[PDB]
């Protein structure tokens, strides 16, 4: 009966993973009707594909082995191991690819998914000579050797690398659709680490100093948790299934420009106009320096030139003409500063 219970748990895990990832892939395919080859779609699609490979070659072998008393089948006997390890590498390499893409999204304006796939495939090639006939043994010391290799390549090294990349991501963010997608990738990383930490912890333990099925189950739960996190974050797939500091400086300088415009339009004489335009000049140069740069600084060139025209009119005693020249600043602001403010939805 306990064997049947283990069979039931494994079959349920297989169902959850295969169904969630197939549904996410179907939602992405349906979005494909709109030409939405968005960068995030291919990454999460191949992440779900990696979770599908995991489900098909981690749970199914386990199910077939729990039935009768071994994985009946030698070429396939080791091929299963190869594919399994392929999925084990991909389950973190796709997250690393996503974190790299989120880094890029706030940097200079597919290849990395194929890079992750190539790593997950090549780094599993030893499984085609480690395991061989009855059932397959990993004979050859070999325990700490391959255990350390697997624990580092699959879990520890990509965890620290992705941590460094996420620190770089906050580095560029700190210096908000991208922030939301960064948070999604962060939740994916956290779930991956929590699911897989005890697995390699005890593997290395046995490796240097000599009930695993519970850890296999908890680890495999990550490949069903990921797609639902993505569905929670991504509005398109959810529908189908049913910079910062520079921006703050820009906001401060634009608020200063607006307050100076308020001072100008209510001004009575040339002196207040000149003072407010002086503050306008300072604020506009400061904003022109900050990054949301060709059309940005060009728009601020126009703003400063209009401020200068208003200053020339004010110095000649033409207060009202200076006020009109300052009113042109509202037109320039609406033309350019609003577009630059729109960058806050990307952050």
């Amino acid at each position: 009966l306990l064997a049947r219970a283990e069979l039931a748990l494994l079959s349920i895990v297989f169902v959850a993973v295969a169904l969630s990832n197939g549904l996410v892939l179907a939602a992405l395919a349906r979005r494909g009707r709109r030409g939405h080859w968005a960068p995030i779609h291919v990454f999460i699609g191949h992440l779900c594909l990696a979770d599908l490979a995991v489900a098909l070659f981690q749970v199914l072998p386990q199910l077939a082995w729990k039935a009768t008393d071994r994985f009946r089948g030698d070429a396939l006997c080791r091929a299963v191991k190869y594919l399994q390890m392929v999925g084990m590498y991909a389950s973190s390499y796709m997250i690393l690819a996503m974190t790299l893409d989120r880094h890029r999204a706030i940097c200079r304006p597919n290849r990395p998914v194929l890079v992750a796939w190539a790593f997950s495939l090549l780094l599993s090639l030893p499984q085609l000579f480690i395991f061989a006939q009855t059932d397959c043994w990993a004979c050859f010391w070999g325990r700490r050797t391959y255990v350390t290799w697997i624990a580092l390549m699959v879990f520890v090294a990509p965890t620290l690398g992705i941590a460094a990349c996420q620190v770089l991501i906050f580095r560029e963010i700190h210096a908000a659709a991208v922030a939301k997608t960064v948070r999604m990738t962060l939740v994916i990383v956290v779930v991956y680490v929590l699911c897989w930490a005890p697995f390699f912890l005890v593997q290395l333990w046995a490796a240097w100093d000599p009930p695993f099925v519970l850890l296999m189950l908890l680890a495999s739960l990550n490949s069903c948790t990921n797609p639902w996190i993505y569905a929670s974050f991504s509005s398109s797939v959810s529908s189908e299934l049913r910079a910062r500091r520079q921006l703050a400086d820009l906001e401060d300088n634009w608020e200063t420009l607006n307050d100076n415009l308020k001072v100008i339009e209510k001004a009575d004489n040339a002196a207040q106009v000149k003072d407010a335009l002086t503050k306008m000049r300072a604020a506009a140069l400061d904003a022109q320096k900050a990054t949301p740069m060709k059309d940005f600084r060009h728009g601020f060139d126009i703003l400063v030139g209009q401020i200068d025209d208003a200053l020339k009119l004010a110095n000649e005693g033409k207060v009202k003409e200076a006020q009109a020249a300052a009113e042109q600043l509202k037109t320039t602001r609406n033309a350019y500063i609003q577009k630059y403010l729109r960058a806050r939805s990307t952050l």
Epitope: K274, R281, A282, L285, D286, D301, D308, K312
Partner: antibody
Framework: EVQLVESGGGLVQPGGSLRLSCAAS????????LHWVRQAPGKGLEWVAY????????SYADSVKGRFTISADTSKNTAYLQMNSLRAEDTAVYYC?????????????????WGQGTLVTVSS | DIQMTQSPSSLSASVGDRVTITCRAS??????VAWYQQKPGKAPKLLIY???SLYSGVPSRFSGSRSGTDFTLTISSLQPEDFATYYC??????????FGQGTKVEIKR
Amino acid sequence: EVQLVESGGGLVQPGGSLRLSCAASGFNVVDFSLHWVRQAPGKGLEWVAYISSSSGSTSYADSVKGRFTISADTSKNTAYLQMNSLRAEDTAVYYCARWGYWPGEPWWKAFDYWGQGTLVTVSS
Amino acid sequence: DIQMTQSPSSLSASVGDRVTITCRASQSVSSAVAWYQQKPGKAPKLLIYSASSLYSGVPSRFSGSRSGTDFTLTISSLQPEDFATYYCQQYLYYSLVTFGQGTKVEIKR
């Protein structure tokens, strides 16, 4: 070669009517606004006035408003500062300086060229 | 409207010393501050513009710096040619030009 050459100084009475001439070479007075800056002997630099010979007005410091007048000639490529009702307090060395127009580097490189000083002495 | 203030009116240093002069603008101005070097009997010569940029032809040992309304001129290693007067100015607009009081670098003995 870019240069500013000031002339027309010397000794005048405390009644003014002294005209200083700043000739320009290399950079035309049309392309750059021209400023006169005053330095009393033993004292620091004090801005006096400026003119945009091609696109705008003339501005003066509060210390000289009502007395100094700046003009320019774009065909002689020169600028003039006329000082009336000069006082002994205005005895100083006067410098003619360039300043470019917004936008670009020419505006940021304020007073790239000062030419030379011309001494104006006001005493009875 | 905008006043420039300098504290180190008299700076005594020997050849090779690294020297620093400060200048504060009275308003929340942009990087429109400049540094000039003047020798007695000669017109001032531009050293620093944009409050951080080295003017073409100026020896590389000069360096400017901006922190809000405080601006700094440094000489990495004083030469005997650098014992002169130095001025800071605010050049926010043509009608707003104002200079500091000036600082003089003299030989430490």
